[PDB]
Amino acid sequence: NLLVTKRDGSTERINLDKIHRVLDWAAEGLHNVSISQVELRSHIQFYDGIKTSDIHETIIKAAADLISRDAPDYQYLAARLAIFHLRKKAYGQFEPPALYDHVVKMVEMGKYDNHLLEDYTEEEFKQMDTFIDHDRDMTFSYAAVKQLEG
Amino acid sequence: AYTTFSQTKNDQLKEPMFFGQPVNVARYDQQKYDIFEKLIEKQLSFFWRPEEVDVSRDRIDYQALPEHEKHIFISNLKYQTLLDSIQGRSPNVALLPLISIPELETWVETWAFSETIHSRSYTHIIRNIVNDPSVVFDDIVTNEQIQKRAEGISSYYDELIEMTSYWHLLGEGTHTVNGKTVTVSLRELKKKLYLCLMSVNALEAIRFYVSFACSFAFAERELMEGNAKIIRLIARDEALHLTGTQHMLNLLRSGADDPEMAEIAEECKQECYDLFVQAAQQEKDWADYLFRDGSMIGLNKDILCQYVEYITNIRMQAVGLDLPFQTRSNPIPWINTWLVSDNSEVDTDDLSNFQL
Amino acid sequence: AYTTFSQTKNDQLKEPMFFGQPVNVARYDQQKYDIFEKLIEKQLSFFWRPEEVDVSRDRIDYQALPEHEKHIFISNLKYQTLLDSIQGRSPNVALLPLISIPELETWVETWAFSETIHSRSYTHIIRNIVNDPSVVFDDIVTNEQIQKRAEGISSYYDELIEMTSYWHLLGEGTHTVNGKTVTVSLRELKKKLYLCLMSVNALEAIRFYVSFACSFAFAERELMEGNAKIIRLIARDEALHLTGTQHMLNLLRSGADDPEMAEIAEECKQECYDLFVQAAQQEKDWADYLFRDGSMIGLNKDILCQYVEYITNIRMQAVGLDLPFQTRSNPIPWINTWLVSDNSEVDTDDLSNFQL
Numbered sequence: 108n109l110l111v112t113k114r115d116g117s118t119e120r121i122n123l124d125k126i127h128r129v130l131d132w133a134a135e136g137l138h139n140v141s142i143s144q145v146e147l148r149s150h151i152q153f154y155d156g157i158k159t160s161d162i163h164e165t166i167i168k169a170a171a172d173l174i175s176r177d178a179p180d181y182q183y184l185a186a187r188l189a190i191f192h193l194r195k196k197a198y199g200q201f202e203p204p205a206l207y208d209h210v211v212k213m214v215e216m217g218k219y220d221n222h223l224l225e226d227y228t229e230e231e232f233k234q235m236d237t238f239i240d241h242d243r244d245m246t247f248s249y250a251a252v253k254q255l256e257g
Numbered sequence: 258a259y260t261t262f263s264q265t266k267n268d269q270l271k272e273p274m275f276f277g278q279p280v281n282v283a284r285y286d287q288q289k290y291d292i293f294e295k296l297i298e299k300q301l302s303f304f305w306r307p308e309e310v311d312v313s314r315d316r317i318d319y320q321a322l323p324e325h326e327k328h329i330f331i332s333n334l335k336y337q338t339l340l341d342s343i344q345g346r347s348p349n350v351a352l353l354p355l356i357s358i359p360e361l362e363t364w365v366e367t368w369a370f371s372e373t374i375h376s377r378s379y380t381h382i383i384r385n386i387v388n389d390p391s392v393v394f395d396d397i398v399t400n401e402q403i404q405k406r407a408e409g410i411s412s413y414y415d416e417l418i419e420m421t422s423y424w425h426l427l428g429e430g431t432h433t434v435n436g437k438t439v440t441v442s443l444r445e446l447k448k449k450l451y452l453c454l455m456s457v458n459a460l461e462a463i464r465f466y467v468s469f470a471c472s473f474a475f476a477e478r479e480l481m482e483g484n485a486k487i488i489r490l491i492a493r494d495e496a497l498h499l500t501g502t503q504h505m506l507n508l509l510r511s512g513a514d515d516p517e518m519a520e521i522a523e524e525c526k527q528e529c530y531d532l533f534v535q536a537a538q539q540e541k542d543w544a545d546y547l548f549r550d551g552s553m554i555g556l557n558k559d560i561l562c563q564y565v566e567y568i569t570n571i572r573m574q575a576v577g578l579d580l581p582f583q584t585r586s587n588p589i590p591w592i593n594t595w596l597v598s599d600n601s602e603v604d605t606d607d608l609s610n611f612q613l
Numbered sequence: 614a615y616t617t618f619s620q621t622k623n624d625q626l627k628e629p630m631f632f633g634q635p636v637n638v639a640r641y642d643q644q645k646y647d648i649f650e651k652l653i654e655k656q657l658s659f660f661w662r663p664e665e666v667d668v669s670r671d672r673i674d675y676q677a678l679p680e681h682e683k684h685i686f687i688s689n690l691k692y693q694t695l696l697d698s699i700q701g702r703s704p705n706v707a708l709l710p711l712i713s714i715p716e717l718e719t720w721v722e723t724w725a726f727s728e729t730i731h732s733r734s735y736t737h738i739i740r741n742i743v744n745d746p747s748v749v750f751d752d753i754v755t756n757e758q759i760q761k762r763a764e765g766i767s768s769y770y771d772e773l774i775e776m777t778s779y780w781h782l783l784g785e786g787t788h789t790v791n792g793k794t795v796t797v798s799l800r801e802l803k804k805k806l807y808l809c810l811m812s813v814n815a816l817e818a819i820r821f822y823v824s825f826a827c828s829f830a831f832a833e834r835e836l837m838e839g840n841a842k843i844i845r846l847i848a849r850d851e852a853l854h855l856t857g858t859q860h861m862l863n864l865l866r867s868g869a870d871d872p873e874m875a876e877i878a879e880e881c882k883q884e885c886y887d888l889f890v891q892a893a894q895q896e897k898d899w900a901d902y903l904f905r906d907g908s909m910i911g912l913n914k915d916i917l918c919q920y921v922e923y924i925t926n927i928r929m930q931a932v933g934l935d936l937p938f939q940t941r942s943n944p945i946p947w948i949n950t951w952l953v954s955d956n957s958e959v960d961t962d963d964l965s966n967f968q969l
C-alpha cells in the first residue's frame with residue numbers, strides 16, 4: 108500500500124483526494140486559478156513516511172510561484188494555503204483558542220509578558236475576544252503572510 | 258445514381274459541398290473553397306510515422322505506475338483506440354458518395370488516411386507497455402463504458418449509409434417492398450448529414466481533446482513519454498480535422514453554398530444543440546471510470562470534468578450553437594504546451610542660469 | 614446491414630477477404646495475411662510529395678518539342694490523369710463496405726490515398742508546361758479517345774455500388790418496387806467483385822505501365838525530366854498496387870479463404886479472360902491517337918504495340934489466366950531503368966628429373 112505521516116504523528120495511507128479539497132478551500136471564490144495547475148507545478152515527490160506538513164509545504168511554494176500578472180488571484184490563493192499551516196502549527200487545530208486562555212498559556216511559556224494578565228481581568232479579555240475577527244486572516248496577500256511567519 | 262466518374266462536364270466551381278454530380282476528374286488547378294485545399298497541404302506536411310518516436314523508457318513506466326493510475330492510462334487509451342478505428346472508415350463510406358467538389362474530395366480521403374496512422378500508433382504503444390495486445394484489444398470491443406458511447410455516434414454514420422443509399426438506388430416519395438413503405442426525401446437526407454457531421458465536430462473537437470489531457474497528464478509527471486510524444490502529433494493532425502468540420506458546417510448553414518440547407522440549419526438548431534450538450538456529459542462520466550479506484554497526482558474527476566465545460570463552451574461558440582455550459586477559465590493551462598506548434602558632463606553653461 | 618463499427622466480437626483471423634462482419638476495431642497486433650500489412654509499410658515509407666521534384670527545365674521542353682510529339686505527351690498525360698482521378702475514390706466506395714479483415718482495410722484507404730498524390734502531381738506538371746490548366750482538364754472529361762475506355766472500367770465500380778448496396782439495404786431473393794423485381798443473390802455479388810477487381814489488376818498493371826513507356830520515352834531523349842522523375846515514383850507506388858490486386862485474386866480463387874469463390878473462379882475463368890485480352894486492345898488503339906501526326910525518335914505505333922503484348926502476356930500469367938497474346942522479348946528494355954529501386958624461382962631441384 109502507500110503511506111503518509113500526518114503532522115499529528117500517526118500514520119495513514121495516501122489519500123490523493125484530501126489534497127484536492129485543500130486547494131479547493133483556497134481556490135474558493137477565485138478565478139484564473141487552476142486547482143490542477145498547482146499540483147503539476149509542484150512536482151511533489153512522494154515517498155513513504157513523508158510528513159503531511161512537508162506535503163502541504165510543497166503546494167504553498169508552488170501556488171506562490173504561479174502568482175503572475177495574468178493571475179493576480181494566485182497571490183491570494185497561496186495566501187489561504189499559507190494562513191492554514193501557520194494557525195495549525197501553533198494551535199494544534201484550525202480555530203485559535205479564546206483570547207484569555209491563550210494570553211495566559213503563552214505567559215508561563217516565557218513568550219507573552221504577564222504584564223497583561225494584571226492590567227486586564229478575564230472579563231475584559233473575553234470581551235475583547237468579540238472584536239477579534241480571526242476571519243481577517245483570510246484577507247492577507249501571501250506577500251505579507253510570509254513576513255508574518257518570521 | 259452514384260458514378261465513380263460522372264460523364265458530364267460540370268463546372269465544379271459551383272457544385273455544393275455535398276449532393277452534387279460526383280467529381281469527374283481529380284484536378285487541383287482551382288477550388289471553390291481554398292480552405293479544404295490548405296487542410297490537405299498542411300496535413301501532408303504533417304505526415305509522420307508512429308514508429309519514429311521511441312517507446313522503450315515507456316515500458317518500465319507502466320510497470321511502475323500505481324494500480325489506480327495504471328487503470329486511468331490503459332483505459333483512456335482504449336477509448337481513443339475505438340474513436341479513430343471507426344473514424345477511419347467512417348468519413349470514407351458516409352461522406353464520399355455525397356462529395357460534390359474536388360478540393361473537398363481529396364481532403365476526405367486524406368482526412369480518413371490521417372486517422373489510420375493514429376490507429377497504427379495506438380497499437381505500437383500497447384505492445385510496448387503491455388504483455389499481450391489481444392487482451393487489451395478484445396476489450397475495446399466488448400466493454401461496459403466503451404460500448405455505451407461506441408454505438409452512440411457510430412449510429413449517425415450507419416444511418417447516412419442507408420438513407421443516402423436509397424437516394425441513388427431509388428428515387429423519391431414512396432417505394433413499397435414486402436408491405437413496407439420507405440420514403441426518400443431530398444430534404445430528409447440533407448438533415449441526415451448536417452446532424453451526422455455535428456457528431457464529428459464533437460468527437461474530433463471535444464471527445465478527443467478531452468482524452469488528451471489524460472495522456473498529457475502523465476507527461477507533466479515525467480511518465481509515459483513516448484505516448485505523450487505520439488499523442489501530441491495526434492492532436493496536431495486533429496486540429497485540422499475539427500477545423501474543417503466547422504468550415505463544412507458554417508458554409509452549409511450560411512446558405513452561400515446550399516440555399517436549401519440554410520433553412521435546415523434553423524429546424525435543426527435545437528436538434529444539434531441537444532447532441533452537443535448531451536454527448537458532452539458522456540465524457541464527464543468516463544472520468545469516474547478512471548478515478549474510480551483513485552485520483553492522480555496530476556488531476557482527478559473534479560478537474561477533468563471542469564475541462565469538458567471549458568472546452569465545449571467555446572467549441573460550440575464556433576459552429577454557431579448556443580452556449581449551455583457555464584463560462585470558465587481553463588482549469589488546465591499546462592495542456593497548451595502540447596497543442597502549440599508541436600516539435601560625466603560638466604559645464605557652467607547650463608548651470609549658470611538656474612535660480613535656486 | 615453495414616455498420617461502421619460491428620457490435621460483435623468476431624475473430625478477424627478467420628474473416629474472409631470480403632463479405633465479413635465489418636471491422637470493429639483498427640488493430641495491427643496481428644494479421645491473417647501478412648501481405649497487406651507489408652504493402653502498407655512499404656508504401657508508407659515510399660511517401661513523397663510531387664512538389665519536391667523541380668519542373669522548371671521541363672517548361673521550355675514542351676515549348677520546343679515538335680507538334681507530332683507535343684501531342685503524344687499532353688495526350689498520354691490526360692489518359693493517366695483520368696485513370697487515377699477515378700481510381701482514387703473507386704477503391705473507397707466499391708471495396709470498403711465489403712472489407713472484412715483489418716489488415717486489408719487499412720491497405721485500401723492507403724491504396725486510395727496513394728492515388729490522390731498522383732492526381733495532385735499531374736496537376737503540378739500541367740501548370741508548368743502549359744499556359745492554362747482548365748483547357749487541358751476540361752478535355753480529359755469530354756474527349757473521344759478519353760471517354761471510350763473511361764466508361765469501360767469505371768462501370769464495374771458503379772455496379773458493385775448498387776449491387777452490394779441492395780445486399781445490405783435489402784435481403785435476398787426477390788423484392789419488387791414499382792412493378793419491377795430485382796434479385797439479390799449472395800453469389801450474384803461475389804462475382805460482381807471478382808470481375809470488378811480483375812479490371813483493376815489491368816488498369817494498375819497493364820493500362821498504366823503502358824502509359825509509362827511513353828513518358829519515360831522522352832526521358833531517354835533528355836526531355837521532360839521533371840515528369841519522368843515524378844512518373845518514376847508513380848510506377849513504384851503502383852508496383853505495390855497490382856501486387857495486391859493479385860494476392861487478393863489468387864487467394865480468392867484458391868478457396869483457402871472463401872470456399873464459395875473457389876467455384877466462381879471457374880465459372881468466370883473465361884469471363885475474366887475476355888476482359889483482360891479485350892481491354893488490352895483498347896491500348897493498342899490509343900497509340901494511333903498519339904502517333905497519328907507522326908512517330909517519335911524513341912518509339913512509334915509499331916513498338917508501343919509490341920509492349921502491350923509482352924506485358925499483358927506475363928501480367929496474366931500471374932493472376933492465373935490463360936495466355937492469348939504471342940510470346941515475345943521486351944521490345945523496350947530501356948524502360949527497366951525506371952522501375953528498378955527508383956532513387957623468379959630457380960632451382961635445379963624440380964628440373965633435374967624431367968626427361969625431355
Ligand SMILES: Nc1ncnc2c1ncn2[C@@H]1O[C@H](COP(=O)(O)OP(=O)(O)OP(=O)(O)O)[C@@H](O)[C@H]1O
Nearest residue numbers: 111113114115119120121122125126129159162163
Ligand atoms: N492521507 C493524506 N495523504 C496525502 N495528503 C494528505 C493526507 N492527509 C492530509 N494531507 C494533506 O497534507 C496537508 C496537511 O493537513 P493538516 O495541516 O490538516 O495536518 P494533518 O496532520 O495532515 O491533519 P489531517 O490530515 O487530519 O487534516 C493537507 O494539505 C492535506 O491535504
